[PDB]
Amino acid sequence: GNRGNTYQPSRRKRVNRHGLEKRLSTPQGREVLLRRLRKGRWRITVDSFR
Amino acid sequence: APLPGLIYWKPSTPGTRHKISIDYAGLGVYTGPPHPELSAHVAKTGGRNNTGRITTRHRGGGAPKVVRDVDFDRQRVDGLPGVVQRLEADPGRSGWLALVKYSPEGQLPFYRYHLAPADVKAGDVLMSGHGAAIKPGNVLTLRDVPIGVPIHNIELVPGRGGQLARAASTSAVVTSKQDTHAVVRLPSSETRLIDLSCRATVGQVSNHLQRSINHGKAGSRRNLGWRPSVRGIAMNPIDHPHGGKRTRRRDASSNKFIITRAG
RNA sequence: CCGCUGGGGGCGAGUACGAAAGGACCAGACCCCUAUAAACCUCUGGUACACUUGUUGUCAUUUACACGGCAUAGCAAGAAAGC
RNA sequence: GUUACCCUGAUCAACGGACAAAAGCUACGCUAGGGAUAACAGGCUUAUCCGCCUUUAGAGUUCCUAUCGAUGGGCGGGUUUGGCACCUCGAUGUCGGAUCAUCGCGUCCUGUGGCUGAAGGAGGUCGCAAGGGUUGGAUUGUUCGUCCAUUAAAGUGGUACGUGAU
RNA sequence: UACCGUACUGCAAACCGACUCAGGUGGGCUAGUAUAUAUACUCAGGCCAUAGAAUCAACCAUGUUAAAGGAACUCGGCAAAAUGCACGCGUGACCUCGGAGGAAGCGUGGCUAAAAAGACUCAGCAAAUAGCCGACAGCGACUGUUUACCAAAAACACAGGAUAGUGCUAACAGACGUAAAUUAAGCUGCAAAAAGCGGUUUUAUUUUUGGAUGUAUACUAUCCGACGCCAAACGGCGGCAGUAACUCUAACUGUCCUAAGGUAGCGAAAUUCCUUGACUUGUAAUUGGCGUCCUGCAUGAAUGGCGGAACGACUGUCGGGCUGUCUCUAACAUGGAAUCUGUGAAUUUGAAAUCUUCGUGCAGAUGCGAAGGCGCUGGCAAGGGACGAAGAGACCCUAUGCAGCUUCGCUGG
Ligand SMILES: [Mg+2]
Ligand SMILES: [Mg+2]
Ligand SMILES: [Mg+2]
Ligand SMILES: [Mg+2]
Ligand SMILES: [Mg+2]
Ligand SMILES: [Mg+2]
Ligand SMILES: [Mg+2]
Ligand SMILES: [Mg+2]
Ligand SMILES: [Mg+2]
Ligand SMILES: [Mg+2]
Ligand SMILES: [Mg+2]
Ligand SMILES: [Mg+2]
Ligand SMILES: [Mg+2]
Ligand SMILES: [Mg+2]
Ligand SMILES: [Mg+2]
Ligand SMILES: [Mg+2]
Ligand SMILES: [Mg+2]
Ligand SMILES: [Mg+2]
Ligand SMILES: [Mg+2]
Ligand SMILES: [Mg+2]
Ligand SMILES: [Mg+2]
Ligand SMILES: [Mg+2]
Ligand SMILES: [Mg+2]
Ligand SMILES: [Mg+2]
C-alpha cells in the first residue's frame, strides 16, 4: 500500500465541507470566518468566486 | 425427533451441515409481500441514537427493514367479526402475525395485523368484547377469562394495548382473582397483579418451532442485522479490564404488584 | 621478488628376520591411480538464436504449389567453427 | 484572648527530622544526558587454566629415571573461567558456516635421528623439521559431541575465539 | 419552447501520488479462425517521442539447454524442474454417510478417408492456455477477519451451549440542572332581566434518543467455542516417616499446619531441569517426529479433560516421480554493466602533499620514535582498513524527567 494520495478531489464534498454555508451554520465556524477576515485573507472560503 | 414444520438441511457442505430452518408449508399462506398500506419502509438504525454514537452494540446490516402496523389493543374492532384471511411471517418478531379483514356495515372492508394464536387456520372469525367466546384468538377482559387457561398479549394499564407474553410460543396463566388485582403467573415464573379491566388475548402464541431453529452459519444470523461480538478478555485494559449483582431500580413504583420474582 | 617440488598401492620381497604365525626398512628407479598447478581442443561429450530436416495453429497466398510473419529460436531432432 | 516563664508530646530509627496522606508496571514506551554506571571487545592482571621443569617417595614380576608421576617449590602465555572499569553509548556484527586467506609450532601425516622391556613388523616416548596435506556427510540453531568408513592423517591455536560497505 | 454543459484529456505526459512517477482511478461497445470476454494469430482502429550508436569484458538480473548421478545441497528439496487437457476404464482406509475423490493407477487423441482403412514422424494433450501425488502426527470444527509500511497465524470471529441481569417509562448505553404546545366533548359553577369567564375528567394533533414500532422461545453482559463419548463466579486441589513368605513399590493403616489435598479418563507433552529418559521401529549413521513405559523441576470437565470426517498460502516428519539446489559447473539468449555522443544528481566533507612493520600512546596511529620502502597520474575490478557513511536512542544507568496502564497505594461526592 503506497500512501500520499489522501486527497481524492470532489466538488460536492469540497463545497459541502469548507464552503460558506457550513461555516455560517455554526457559531465557531462564524468566528473562523471572522478571524479569516481579521487576518486579511483574499480568499475567504474555498467556493468564493465572482 | 423430526418435527413436522422444519426444513432439515442435508449436510451437503459445512454451514448447511447443522442447519435447521422453519418450513413455510406448515405456514402455507406466508407467501406475499407485506400489505402496501399496513406497512412502511423505515431506514435501519445500526444501533446508533439521535447523537449518532453506538448505544446498543453488535447490531447493523442485513435485509431492508420493513415495519408492520400490528394492533395490540383491538379496541376499535370490538364486537366486529374479523375473518382471518392469511397468516404472515414477519422477520421483526419471533412469533408470526395473522392478517384479519373486518367488514363493518357502514364502512368499506379493511385489514389489520394481530399476533397469531395456535388455533388460526386462515379461515377463522375472531371476536373481541365482554360477551366474546372462549375459543383461541378472542380478546376478553381478565374477569371473563377462566383460572388456568393460557392467555397472551396482556396489558398492564388499560387502554394501552397488549405488552405481556407476546413472544413466540409463550403464554401467561391467571391463578387467583383478587377483586382489583388478579394474580397472574408471567412466563418467567413471576407472579404479577394485573387490573381486571385489562384484556387478555385467549390462546397460546404460535411459532413453537422457534426454539428448534438453527442458523448453521455466521452469515445467516449476520444477514438478520447482527454484527459479530468480541469477548472481553481479547483486549487491552483501556478497552475492557479483561486482558452476581441485581440491577433492577430499587424503590420503584411497581414493587406493589409482584408477589414472587422471576424464578 | 613470486611460485616452489603432494602422496598411496605394487615391483623390489613370500624375503634379512623369524621355532612359528607374522611380514619390513631404501623410494634408489619402473608400473598404475589420485590430487594440486599450468595449459590444449587431438579424442570423448555439452552448448551453438541469420545452419539442415520434420511439423501444429493462425495471418498473408486471383493455386490453400513453393516462399514469408508470429506463437520461448513456436516446437522437436541433428549439426561445423568457437568456448 | 495576647505575651513571657516553668514544662510535656513521634522507632520524626531515612535519627540536621519534603511541602497533609501515600504502591507498582512498561518486550508500546517518549525526552535529556553518561563511555562519570554495565553487555557484545580492545587495554591491565594471572587467582583459576595451559605448557616447561625441579624434588623425585614410589609403581613398573626385581631395579626412580623404557614408560607414568605422588607431595612441595618455581618460570613462561593470556587462546579458559574470573577481577578492574582505562577506550568508544553524537547508536559501531559478536555465541554459526559459505567462500577465500595469512602466520606460529606445543607435528596428525609425509621427511627424519636417539633410547628402547628393540624378533624387523607394531608400538611408547624423546630430538630436528611448518614445504604442503588433513576428505565424507547422517543428527543437533550448536563453534560443543558422537558414530556411519573411507585415508598417510581426518592437528591445535593467533587471527576484535579471521572474514555481513562479499 | 428559455438558462447551464458542449474545446481538449480521460488506465493517463493533462486525474490522485513533489515528477513526463512501472503505483491507484468508475461505467459501457465490439469482428474471424473458434469455442468461453481464457489462449495463439488477426479485423475495425491505434501505436512503434521523450536517450541514441556499435561490440566478445568481468560481474548482476531474467531465461534456454546440458553427459553420469540425483536432496548427496541446505536450518528446512527454499528456488527451479515436474503433473497440468477433453473421451473410456477404474477408484483406498477413515467418516458426522455428505465426503475423502479429479483418490491412486491404465488406455485414446493430430493428418487423409461420402467414410470397413491407412500414410510416415524421433515426436501426433505436435505450438499457447488449463492439479504433483500418497502416508504419519500437532493446533484450530468449517467459509471468513486481523497488525495500511518486517508477523495472516495456533491469534479474533463463527453457528451452538452455559451462567447472570431484565415484568416494560425494562435492563443496558447516551443528552442532562426536571418536558410539555394547540384544539374538542362531557360534568359543571358565580352573581344575576335573555350572557361572559373559569375548575375538573376523557379524547384528537403534535412533541416524547437506541434497545424497539421488540418484550422472558425476547433483549443485554460474561465465558467456552461445531458436533460426538463420559465454584461452567476469581482459581487451586500438601507433607512426615514405616507396614506384603529373595531384593524393591506402600495398595490399608500411624501423625502435623490445613478451604481442600487433582477422579474413570492424561503425560519428557506447545508445555519434564536431569536428557543423547532406558523400549520397538525409523537411517549406514537421528538430540528434530511418530507408537509404549514411568521418576508431573514447573499437567489435567469450563484456565473445559478423551479422540475422530472434511477443511488450512498453519507447523514437524516419511516414500514415488522430477530436475543444475548439489557432486562441478559449461555454452547460449535477453537487459543492465564496460566504449562513444547528448542530458545530467546525491550521501559525504576541519585542512591534507594521507606508505609498511615493530614499539609507544585516552590503552587497536597515515601524522609520534626506530628501521625500511616508494618514478608520477589514472581507467576497469575486489572491498581488509580509514574505529567507512547512514539515526545526537539497539541495550544499561541517571534525572525536582514525562506519558499511558494496573492495584486490598493515598485522598476526594
Ligand atoms: Mg492493490
Ligand atoms: Mg499531500
Ligand atoms: Mg575441432
Ligand atoms: Mg551452422
Ligand atoms: Mg503479422
Ligand atoms: Mg565466458
Ligand atoms: Mg532523610
Ligand atoms: Mg508528603
Ligand atoms: Mg573484557
Ligand atoms: Mg494501470
Ligand atoms: Mg511519491
Ligand atoms: Mg502513470
Ligand atoms: Mg499479435
Ligand atoms: Mg525509441
Ligand atoms: Mg540424462
Ligand atoms: Mg499442447
Ligand atoms: Mg472455499
Ligand atoms: Mg481461511
Ligand atoms: Mg432469566
Ligand atoms: Mg547491453
Ligand atoms: Mg600500533
Ligand atoms: Mg592501479
Ligand atoms: Mg574504480
Ligand atoms: Mg529523582
Residue numbers in the entry:
A (entry chain A): 231 to 280
B (entry chain a): 69 to 311, 330 to 349
Tell me what the authors wrote about this structure, in their words:
The large subunit (LSU) was resolved to 2.9 Å, while the small subunit (SSU) was reconstructed at 5.49 Å and further refined to 4.19 Å for the body and 4.47 Å for the head using a focused refinement approach. Reconstruction of the LSU revealed eight additional r-proteins, named mL113 to mL119, plus PPR*, a putative PentatricoPeptide Repeat (PPR) protein. With the exception of mL119 at the exit of the peptide channel, all these proteins are relatively large RNA binders composed of repeated alpha-helical folds, including a mitochondrial TERmination Factor (mTERF) protein, several OctotricoPeptide Repeat (OPR) proteins, and PPR*. In contrast to the SSU, the nine rRNA fragments in the LSU are all stabilized by the newly identified Chlamydomonas-specific r-proteins. Fragments L7 and L8, the largest of all, make up domains IV, V, and VI, which form the catalytic core of the ribosome. Surprisingly, while it was anticipated that 5S rRNA should be absent from Chlamydomonas mitoribosome, we identified an RNA density at the typical position of the 5 S rRNA in the central protuberance (CP). This rRNA density could be attributed to the L3a rRNA fragment. Proteins mL115, mL116 and mL117 stabilize the 3′ extremities of L1, L2a, and L5, respectively, by binding the single-stranded rRNA fragments in their inner groove. The LSU reconstruction revealed the presence of a specific r-protein, mL119, precisely located at the exit of the peptide channel. Interestingly, the membrane interaction in Chlamydomonas is mediated via two contact points. mL119 forms one contact, and mL113 create a second contact point directly with the membrane, similar to ES-H96 in yeast.
The final step of gene expression, translation, is carried out by specialized mitochondrial ribosomes (mitoribosomes). Here, we present a biochemical and structural characterization of the mitoribosome in the model green alga Chlamydomonas reinhardtii, as well as a functional study of some of its specific components. Single particle cryo-electron microscopy resolves how the Chlamydomonas mitoribosome is assembled from 13 rRNA fragments encoded by separate non-contiguous gene pieces. In contrast to flowering plants, where rRNAs are largely expanded, the C. reinhardtii mitoribosome is characterized by its reduced and fragmented rRNAs.
